Design goal:
The structure is cut from a larger assembly and holds four copies of chain A. Helix content of chain A is about 50%, strand content about 0%. Chain A has two helices and no strands. The longest helix of chain A is centred in the first third of the chain and has 17 residues. At the B-D interface, loops of B face strand 3 of D. The PDB classes it as toxin. Keywords: toxin, complex, glycan. The entry is titled "Xenorhabdus nematophila XptA1 in complex with porcine mucosa heparin".
Amino acid sequence: YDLAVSLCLMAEQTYQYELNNAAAHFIKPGAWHGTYAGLLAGETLMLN
Amino acid sequence: EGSAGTTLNGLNVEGTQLQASLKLSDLNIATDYPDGLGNTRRIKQISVTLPALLGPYQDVRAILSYGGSTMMPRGCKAIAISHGMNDSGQFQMDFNDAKYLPFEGLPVADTGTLTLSFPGISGKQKSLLLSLSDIILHIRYTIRS
Amino acid sequence: LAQMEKSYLEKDERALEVTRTVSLAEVYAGLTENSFILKDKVTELVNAGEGSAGTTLNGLNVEGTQLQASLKLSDLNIATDYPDGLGNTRRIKQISV
Amino acid sequence: AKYLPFEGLPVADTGTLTLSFPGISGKQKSLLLSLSDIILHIRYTIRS
């Protein structure tokens, strides 16, 4: 989960550099709900 | 020892490194066209032409550097001029590259400092600097709406 | 694999690709120890297929029927051709003759 | 995709670069006699 959210942040930084807009925040904070042991994190990241 | 012109728009000799500066905001690039065609006018790619009399199988040593505060993803900050004739640093420079080209995405109307530094002004590149006609850049930029 | 891939993507930068054309006759003339003229040493060693040229690691030698010309890469001062503020991993990309 | 020859060699190493001509007295005798000089196109890459 740490590695894939780092890759998604890499892609978000790439999109914000390509389209000249620093406010395009597409990866929502969260998606690792520890009380359900972080399930569906890949579903939320695929959605983003 | 000396320099040339004002700061940010002229030459300077620093030790054994002749460097030529340029302020990109003073070139009026974004107003070369009407503004009805897009405001995101970013630099695509820059190559340097130095039409001097190079020696036989003789190299040029020069770095087209950038001074400023933009993002500029990685080592795309500067190129090294070795061919001297309409070249970037890249062997077989290829547009539509998967990686980022150097100087890509720089805002063409920014207040940056574009510095071309020659290592070894008094060394083996003394006659080459003496035989220099003028400095010519191929700044290619992209307007997008 | 994803750890190593993410580290590669985070630590990969573009380049600084420098072509350096080196004429061996210049190095053989500015050898400062048993320096010589290449065009005369080649015909000397061809018409007399026994001798060598200059010191070891920086000169010619005839070995049987194989004329070989040596060169020590440390003696060419390639890494100090530029300031060291632009990177230390200065590795050879490609060589052609 | 494959590695080019002489790729990744440290440009400041204490190596020995040898250019060997087979057949100095054979058919490559006149070619060695007609040699002007030896010139290498060493292309190297600086990386931070």
